[PDB]
Ligand binder design. Structure first.
Ligand SMILES: N[C@@H](Cc1ccc(I)cc1)C(=O)O
Ligand SMILES: [Ca+2]
Ligand SMILES: [Zn+2]
Ligand SMILES: [Zn+2]
Length: 275
């Protein structure tokens, strides 16, 4: 797998930050900063050669969108998906929650095209709307995916909050092959990981219909323990993300090292699991 350039991921976050500032301070469902976020991500994918689909739904009286991006080619009967919710709460720009996962997934999709990769499995990336309303976009996708297409899914990888400023390195303890893939990447860095428990994200509708899932998380409102600060640094007794769901979930609310490592781990897992 390629090394995902941290600067490229950070540049997507800058664009999402400007989109929030240009649209009332947020990227929330039913508000213009969300569709503007979709438009940015979709244009990058279209230019890289993806087949993109805007999947519309209505929730709360307002139109929502999921953005689906299929990389042409690969085994139609073995589809590997990766995704991230692209909405924020209305209090702020949602840069860690979840610009971080959205940007890592986008940069991995662009890296596939830059590398000339032809995965054996068909790759499909997704950016979900209305996750903050209760997983509404990812539930809509799974609810509207015919059972014959559901059975073609080899896995769903989820990235939701992966740049927390006082990070831990959590790996979902779900499908064993996906989990092993992520833990192997972190072992090569000599960075320990822990099982995710803090978390309620967009892998749940896939997990609940038997699709193998996994993912990465760096923590939200829970407090980092003394033991976790000893293994990862940062500040014991402070939240992993002191700006969770806050107006201060801005460009300053990112730990570059965690964003870089989790973005690189995302690309590692997508390459490994697709061929
Ligand atoms: N989905 C939450 C943040 C979150 C990430 C990962 C897990 I696992 C659980 C929760 C939100 O959007 O606020
Ligand atoms: Ca990198
Ligand atoms: Zn989130
Ligand atoms: Zn959230």
């Amino acid at each position: 797998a390629p090394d995902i350039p941290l600067a490229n991921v950070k540049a997507h976050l800058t664009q999402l930050s400007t989109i929030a500032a240009n649209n009332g301070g947020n990227r929330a469902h039913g508000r213009p900063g969300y569709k503007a976020s979709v438009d940015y991500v979709k244009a990058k994918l279209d230019a890289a050669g993806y087949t993109t689909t805007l999947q519309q739904f209505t929730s709360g009286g307002a139109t929502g969108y999921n953005l689906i991006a299929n990389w042409p080619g690969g085994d139609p009967n073995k589809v590997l998906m990766a995704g991230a919710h692209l909405d924020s709460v209305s209090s702020g720009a949602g840069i860690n929650d979840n610009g971080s996962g959205s940007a890592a997934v986008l940069e991995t999709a662009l890296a596939v095209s830059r590398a000339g990769y032809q995965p054996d499995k068909h790759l499909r990336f997704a950016w979900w709307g209305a996750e903050e309303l209760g997983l509404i976009g990812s539930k809509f996708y799974v609810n509207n995916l015919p059972s014959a297409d559901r059975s073609k899914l080899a896995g769903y990888l989820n990235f939701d909050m992966i740049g927390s400023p006082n990070p831990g390195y959590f790996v979902y303890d779900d499908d064993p092959v996906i989990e092993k893939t992520f833990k192997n990447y972190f072992a090569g860095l000599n960075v320990p990981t822990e099982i995710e428990t803090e978390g309620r994200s967009d892998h749940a509708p896939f997990k609940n219909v038997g699709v193998p899932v996994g993912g990465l998380f760096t923590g939200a409102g829970y407090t980092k323990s003394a033991a976790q600060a000893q293994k990862w640094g940062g500040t014991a007794g402070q939240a992993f993300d002191r700006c969770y769901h806050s107006s201060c979930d801005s460009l300053s609310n990112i730990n570059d090292t965690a964003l870089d490592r989790n973005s690189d781990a995302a690309a590692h897992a997508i390459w490994t699991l697709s061929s």
